[PDB]
Design a protein around this ligand. Sequence first.
Ligand code: HEM
Ligand code: HEM
Ligand code: HEM
Lengths: 722, 722, 305, 83, 84
Amino acid sequence: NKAISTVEPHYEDTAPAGVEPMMPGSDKTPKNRNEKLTQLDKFRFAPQGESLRTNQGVKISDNQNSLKSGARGSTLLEDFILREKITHFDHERIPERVVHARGTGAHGYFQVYESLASYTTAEFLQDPSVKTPVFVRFSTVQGSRGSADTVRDIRGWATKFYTKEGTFDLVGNNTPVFFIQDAIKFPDFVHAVKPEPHNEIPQGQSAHDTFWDYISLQPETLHNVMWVMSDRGIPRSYRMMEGFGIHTYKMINAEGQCHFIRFHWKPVYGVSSLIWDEAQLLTGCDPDFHRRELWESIEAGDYPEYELGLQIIPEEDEHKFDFDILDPTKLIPESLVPVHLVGKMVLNRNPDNYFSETEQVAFCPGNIVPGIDFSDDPLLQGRLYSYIDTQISRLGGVNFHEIPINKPICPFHNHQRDGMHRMSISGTANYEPNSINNNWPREAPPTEGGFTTYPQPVNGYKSRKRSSTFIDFYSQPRLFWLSQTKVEQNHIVGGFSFELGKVVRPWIRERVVNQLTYIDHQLAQSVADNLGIKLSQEQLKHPLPGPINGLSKDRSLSMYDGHHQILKSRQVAILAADGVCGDAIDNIMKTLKKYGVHGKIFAPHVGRITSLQGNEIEVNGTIEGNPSVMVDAVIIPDGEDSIDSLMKNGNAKHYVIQAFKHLKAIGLQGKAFKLYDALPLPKPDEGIVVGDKAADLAEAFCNVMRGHRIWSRESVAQEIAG
Amino acid sequence: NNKAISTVEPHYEDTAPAVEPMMPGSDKTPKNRNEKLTQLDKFRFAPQGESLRTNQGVKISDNQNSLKSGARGSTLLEDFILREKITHFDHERIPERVVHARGTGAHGYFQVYESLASYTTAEFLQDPSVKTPVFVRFSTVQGSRGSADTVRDIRGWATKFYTKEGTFDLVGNNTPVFFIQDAIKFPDFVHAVKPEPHNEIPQGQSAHDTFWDYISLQPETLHNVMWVMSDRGIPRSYRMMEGFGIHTYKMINAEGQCHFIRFHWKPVYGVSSLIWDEAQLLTGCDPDFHRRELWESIEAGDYPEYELGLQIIPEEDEHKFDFDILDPTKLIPESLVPVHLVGKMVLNRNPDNYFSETEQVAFCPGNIVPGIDFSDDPLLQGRLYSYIDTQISRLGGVNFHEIPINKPICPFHNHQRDGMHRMSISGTANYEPNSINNNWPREAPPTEGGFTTYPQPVNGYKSRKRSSTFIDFYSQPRLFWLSQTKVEQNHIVGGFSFELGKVVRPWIRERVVNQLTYIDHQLAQSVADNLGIKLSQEQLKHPLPGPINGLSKDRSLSMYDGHHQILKSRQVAILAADGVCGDAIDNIMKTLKKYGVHGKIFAPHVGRITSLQGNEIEVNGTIEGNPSVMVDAVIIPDGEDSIDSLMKNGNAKHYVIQAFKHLKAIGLQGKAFKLYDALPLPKPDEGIVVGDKAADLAEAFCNVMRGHRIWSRESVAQEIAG
Amino acid sequence: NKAISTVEPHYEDTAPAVEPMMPGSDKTPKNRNEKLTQLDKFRFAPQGESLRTNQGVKISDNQNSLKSGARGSTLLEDFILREKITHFDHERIPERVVHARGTGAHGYFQVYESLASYTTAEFLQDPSVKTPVFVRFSTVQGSRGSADTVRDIRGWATKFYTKEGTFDLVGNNTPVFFIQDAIKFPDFVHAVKPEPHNEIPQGQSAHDTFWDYISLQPETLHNVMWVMSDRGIPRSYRMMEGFGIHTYKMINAEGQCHFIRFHWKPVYGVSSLIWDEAQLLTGCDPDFHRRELWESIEAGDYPEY
Amino acid sequence: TQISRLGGVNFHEIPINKPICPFHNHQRDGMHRMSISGTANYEPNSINNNWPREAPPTEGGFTTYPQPVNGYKSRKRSSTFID
Amino acid sequence: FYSQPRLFWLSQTKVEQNHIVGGFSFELGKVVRPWIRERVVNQLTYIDHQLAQSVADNLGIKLSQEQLKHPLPGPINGLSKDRS
Ligand code: HEM
Ligand code: HEM
Ligand code: HEM
């Protein structure tokens, strides 16, 4: 009977009569509310106690069998329940985004610190009491929907502000510049970096011939190549990277005064990155690492938190720099123009349905609000036409603003009608001006908030031509290079050398290092050596760029110079087996909890382990299923029986070797050193903390961790086999 | 001027000025409501006092001008306001319906007279106190959108019942049978009747070679061809035609017993039709006649009302007929199986937005509800697949049930997810069986309303073969013929003759006429004569079918033998110019209103005319703008100046000649007879009412109108130049 | 036997042992050009071929679904039925948002003398070259199945397939348009199109919203005059004028710009219907202009402009 | 699924999907129609002498094997499957 | 807005002018809201007074003296008519 039951209608109950699973945001954080989420409640489905039905509302009695001509016969065309279930499934998929297909979404809110009326009339930047809702999607660039999170790529960062005066979309990246200057080159650049069109190889990688062929022939790309070749290209979390709108925008105030503006997002949890070998392994054992990290951090209360910052330039200072502020391959150095922190954004609710919310969300740089305006940046100008154009195919037509995640929370009356999947039913005149409805809805005068374009002077000739002022390809790459710590420079050389290693045609590699000789002679020579290229005497004498408004370095372009390492919310592995020391774990956990750090007990099997004190303690998962690359640091408590089993276990001995090679902090209590001493690992350096007392060993352990990575270990780490 | 310049600058002031036009149903009849219309209220937005906005909620300040470089310069790509407005316009159109593209909809409600629990468990048929909302779309078949209403064609009649146990679609036609027997022939039939593939000619007509080519080679089509050749093919109004589901369905009661069922709609306003010459002129001067007639019926309170009837056949009687009840080219004569009137449907509210509601509604025969089931009609079986398949591309994907007009008014939880334009947001398990949500939504046992298929026996071999019980093509066409009055038979001969006259290939005309010799010899003879064909004496004695289950004729297949002529809601033209007798008009008007007739005053100009008594009378429209084909009858009041104006007006004199030739009633008061006597018309017959006192004459006029048309005049009228 | 024959597979001849309109390849096969020769690669010739599925499988019985017994239920495994029905279900594509109602023909263009003085445009350089064209004529307001002889602007779109690119001259049969700035097109078109609550009227500007918009926008009056005149109701697409409306530029080999407006001047003259006659034609032949064009080409009275 | 994945009912006209043999029938139109057809688009016709034509089973026309079918209309898992 | 409507009107033969009048009169006669017909007829008084008077008569509109005295546009680069 037990078996027969499973292939018959299921009228009975099936439920049985870290610790907890990820759940929809409405189930785990229902108290994190905002105005947009309340609007989305109108479309949420609560199925408790409901019948299974067709889409026309008809109750289904047997969801286990097709209508057949007998129990062993042929399926009947009149089985409308079967066909409706299969047809819906057949049409589930919609096109992925042409770029940034791979992405993660969360809900939140934004508050302005104080009014910015001095700069902009934008409603959401006027009143610090308002909680204006937001939805953010983070993304990679090159890979399709199912590619890995921790690839070496640019990360996209798109924030939708549901304001009372319109929806504003801030659509940026995690590096302050882009690869190209004119939007007309976007298909060329994207085709070059995407998988090649004959074999569709490789996925989520720029490490191939067509990409570097393009770089080598378009020096304007070099600056942002530097950024992706650095550890910026492999962030540890979406909570620990920076954000930039990249383009110079405009803000107009109540007086009609124009300020040029560049947008910034500064992480409250600091700026931290992976290292390349650890990033690549993480894509094998968890392609969802960033998506999972963001989701769990919100369910844990370590809400992503970012401060919106603005670089502000008076319209008269437009030409005060050695670069064009309209050139998206140029950053504005924070020395020259400081970033004013103007408000805070917090992400505190996961979506309920990924496809409905994250997949269907539409962001366009053209979605501005009164108080913001566009500059003549010729890359931004192309983006204004592309976002809306692509969303008509991806999202089914021109009514994609009626999709719940995309609706504004303000009114939005106009004379537009019809289109595919038209939701609203409009009774009134559909042309303007009309008299039969007394011309409602009516144009809004500027003094009442109607959008106007700032009247910027426009002079020249109709021409296709790159501005003379855009022709500066090497200076900002050099600024970025000289601004990096020694270990960050080595990692940039690593990225270049690994990537060009996968390039088949030699002349592309040669042309690329040749481009590097115009940035820094020692960067070019390091990369040339890793690739067997001998530089000529002429190449070694290649002219280098001078400073930029008297600047040769800028500390802000470095990650590990200004000690932007936050300890709250990091993850620590605790390698325990049966026979571990109970009191140690408690004191490790109490110390970690004191610092906002999460520790996870990893054991050979799942469930519980029993301590030498005879008590049972819950495991978070196996050592095998949670390698060191998923945690920030390892700690091994004492317990002779625990240590003995760990030493027989290849995964747990490798756990420490790999933790070591990836420059992480390793804590060893008591005879735990028994395990370190067994491996081919050198004498404990500054990131190896031994000790017999757990709270003290934990306190010192948490303090090695404040440095993120033991950069000193790097040279001896290379020679360790593992 | 300063007013001139004003028209092309933002319009911030009022445009309105400080018998009625057609209006949305929400403006005209807000009192008429039901559960479906209350649901649609959520999707209706009021624009009064509201700003013109973008779809993102941004107030627009200038709707009159593109963003340009200079007031005489080039248009700029950053004008996101212009591009959004134009892009939405650009994507307004969706594919029209592949058949029945030309249609018109209305809202209403349905009530069952008493419980049908003896025959079915269908919820909406159990409880007379329940008001089930409906939406009904009427249509032609062949024409595209924009084709004319009063073509000679089959009329579609689709009714959507929004019940509490699911949405039920009764998708019918206005004739009791269809052209073909098997769904695999439908594309061939449709391609044959549609415009021809090389030149896309003719629109709205079956009168062309390929259609009659298909008929001559497919005799199974002859029965419905007789229906559409008769006056049933040109109905006067959607309120005055019959409706049929055509197929035999099944009804299943609580005891599991099965009754074979056929659905009927009986119009309380009667069954009446135009004549061919009138129908064709009407397509010229009002292609929207029926769509307008329906709209204005509801606004005038002349609501379309119909009784739902059932022919009810116990299971064991299935094979007691001389034809197969599963054959869709066969009707079940009402003399054999009567139609039981089981309920009433009232259409009492026009839509607000035609596209949102009439264009986007989706109906399928497979959308049945528990208590109803399908039969093995092989045409019906193929229909179940077609309606959902066409809608996935016509309505933009598999979520077209989430478009407001298609949503059910009951719950509809299931495990379907995603698809284009996904409105719902679901959090719970998306598979069945599941334990992580205790298997909600859950399958419903049949005794809780779970849908089940009645366990009909199935025996045979897999094969493609026409059932021998279907090969019976001339019986029912002859039965239909013999059931017609001689006037109706004459018009059938006219339909055939006119249509075949437009076929170019003479052998097509000859082969059709040969098919007619197997239905009736006089019919074949009369059509042959009009086509210049000579029949052999062999053809004049081709064997004819005999009676069907003891009937040679059935008066219910006739329109005019019956007495279904309703005078209320008909239209009357009152021809008048200045100097008309104003007391006469007032008395005519009072009389017409007494019988619910609508008199419209048609003059040589709009505005007002002036009574010979010096009074102003408001005019409905011009004589030239409202020819006699638009009204049911004509009455000319007295006033010698009016009659003398009307006598110099060629259109006014054509009004009487045309209405005379279209067999309509004409009243002439006093000197008005002077107009009639100058026309080359014979002596007043029974349809020409002459009289001096206005009310007296109007009374006799209304009585003549009770007969619809003056059939006796037909031969006299052929001679008349007009 | 004859009766049953019609519901069984037809493996026999059906043709019998003043002339209908026919596809261009059957009536005027000698009239050819480079474009038509290119289209030939996509013409199917079905004489002597088996009826087949789209995957190439021969079909034995096109008269019957696959059932469980001759009186039974249709089976889901009938792939032939579902392929044929599915393709029928998906025949329709959206109509053009304006000019939905239209009529097309192939032809050629020749230049009289080189226009090198004014333009470098390849197709206006060499008089010995026949440039293939395809022309579509249309109304504006009505949907696909609306009548021909309505009162409306007529669209007149010509595709020149030149050796240096496809050039499209997309014009009307009046020399001016109703509005000045594109931002107003959706308002103008919405005002003229059938009204949104009832979708009335078809193929007519004679309704409130259109004239409401005219009354508030005097820039429309010039073209409103053209369509209230007998320009609004032409006798034939062969007897109307054509215009690009807009000023274009033409650039010669020396970089010199001239302002240009385009004109089509019909060789068969400019003739129109009168209003009452045009309205009656829509009733008794809604395809009148479409038919007239097809038939004039078939008779040798080629449209020339 | 392929009607929406590949853009309509004419995906067999995409080169990789086309057969290498003839495939005449009466199907017409649909999105991105590449074939251009002049002949009658319905069957049976006489204006084209009914070409293209059904093929007898003995000349290659597809037929279903006449398998016997006996039972009741039913939603049920075969007991012969419970294993 | 009015100069070229007047040029086009003055170029028409009298029968072509009569047909323009019929076009306006028939179309406006199907407009329901009377103020729309009036506003349009008013617009015509700025093009040609006899055009406006004929159409206003067909629609039963009485024109005011201000309307019959509405200022008309002048020649276009010397032209008042163009027979093409
Ligand atoms: C300043 C450099 C650029 C940045 C920072 C940028 C940023 C982004 C981001 C973050 C997304 C993903 C948005 C999401 O999550 O849905 C995106 C998508 C996209 N971008 Fe860009 N982009 C840039 C340049 C361009 C250019 C030059 C074009 C082409 C003109 C372009 C066209 C697109 C398109 C078509 C999408 C997909 C939009 C969708 O399907 O919803 N972008 N961009
Ligand atoms: C009993 C004979 C039939 C009747 C009475 C019938 C009735 C109708 C009606 C009234 C409509 C218009 C529904 C609406 O207003 O939206 C319609 C549409 C349609 N029918 Fe039929 N039909 C019949 C046979 C067929 C057959 C044999 C097929 C093909 C298998 C078919 C396929 C369709 C399709 C595809 C539509 C368009 C549906 C849409 O786009 O929403 N019908 N039918
Ligand atoms: C100078 C005034 C204009 C003229 C003479 C004109 C002419 C035409 C013509 C002849 C067609 C039909 C082409 C065909 O046969 O396929 C057409 C279609 C169209 N026009 Fe215009 N038009 C004008 C203004 C506009 C404006 C202002 C817009 C909007 C910005 C517009 C948008 C369209 C669109 C969307 C179509 C349909 C194109 C298609 O679906 O293939 N036109 N126009």
